[PDB]
Amino acid sequence: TKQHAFTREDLLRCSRGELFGPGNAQLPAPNMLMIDRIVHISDVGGKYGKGELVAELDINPDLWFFACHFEGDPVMPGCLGLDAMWQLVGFYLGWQGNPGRGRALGSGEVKFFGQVLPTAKKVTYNIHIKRTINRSLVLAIADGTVSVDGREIYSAEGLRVGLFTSTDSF
Amino acid sequence: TKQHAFTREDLLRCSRGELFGPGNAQLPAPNMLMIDRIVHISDVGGKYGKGELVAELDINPDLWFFACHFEGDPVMPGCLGLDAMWQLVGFYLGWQGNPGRGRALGSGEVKFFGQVLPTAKKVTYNIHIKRTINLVLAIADGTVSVDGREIYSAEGLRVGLFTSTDSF
Ligand SMILES: Clc1ccc(CNc2n[nH]c(-c3ccco3)n2)cc1
Ligand SMILES: Clc1ccc(CNc2n[nH]c(-c3ccco3)n2)cc1
């Protein structure tokens, strides 16, 4: 809760289990990691007054997904930008100090109304936390947008991620 | 519309633009391709009477995503199983003979209530077409199952075809 920004190195450390500790939240490592840095994370402010994350993914044409998706028509998979939002929401829960491993639980409406081309510079994720529930299962609910070089292209309402001290029920 | 099942090699051919032709729908190539075969595709039947797809992805422990997602806790990314459903809905549109390149437009509710482990054998996707609109787009519900067990649902999956993605 004390640190409000994270470098790529921090996120890589997180992916090894070395930021939040063993048994607790881990981001994906590359090539599933869809964030380079967290520019701002807080548990006050945001659209709902319950916290906010802003994060960035640098784009260049040699990112692996461009060559296979699609041949002759390169474009960042929408599913991976969506996943970056789930990644942030999970991270948020770990960052608050909750224990357990992350699993996404889903979302309400998702809309894709733009795209990321290999000639783009930077994708930015804006996440507004709507609610956290610490009752027995720990989860978070949030709204999110994905933008590319200033232009909003995706929205998601009701992103949900949980933490599990035993994922055995999945 | 004439062929009701596709092998992996058909899907690869699709990924190269060589199934539906140039300017028309392409599946992703590996490693974004999340389907090995389409076991059944039709434009009648299904939950809504407007068509159906059943497809499969074989699982083994060496699939690339297991090692990085997550270290010490391998599990297929939910987003990729979701994407498989968008992949199938786009394919459907190309398979009907519509022109243009595919872009997913979103979904209504998505739920993940299970997971794919490296010890699973096979993932199966069931897609029920709800509506096509001829801008061309399709709307569908989908489920993802692993070795018989339903684990994800999506309602209102939407994919469109575009004869120009310059503007998108
Ligand atoms: Cl730090 C952090 C951030 C986000 C997450 C969640 N990511 C996630 N991917 N796939 C699933 C999933 C859910 C069910 C099946 O698969 N969940 C984990 C750790
Ligand atoms: Cl065959 C066939 C099947 C499915 C699709 C769509 N898949 C898809 N991934 N990412 C996007 C997208 C949408 C908006 C931004 O990115 N769309 C294309 C061809």
Provide a descriptive summary of the structure in words:
- The structure is a homodimer.
- By secondary structure, chain A is of the alpha+beta class.
- The first copy, chain A, has a single domain, classed as Hotdog Thioesterase (Thiol Ester Dehydrase, Chain A).
- In chain A, 18% of the residues lie in helices and 35% in strands.
- Chain A has 3 helices and 7 strands, in the order αββααβββββ.
- In chain A, strands 1, 2, 3, 4, 5, 6 and 7 form a 7-stranded antiparallel beta sheet that branches.
- In chain A, a hairpin with a 4-residue loop joins β5 and β6.
- Chain A is globular.
- The two termini of chain A are 29 Å apart.
- The interface between A and B is large, with 46 and 46 residues.
- The complex binds N-(4-chlorobenzyl)-5-(furan-2-yl)-1H-1,2,4-triazol-3-amine (7SB) (2 copies).
- One N-(4-chlorobenzyl)-5-(furan-2-yl)-1H-1,2,4-triazol-3-amine sits between chains B (25-27, 86-87, 90-91, 94, 102-104, 159) and A (75, 77-78, 112, 115).
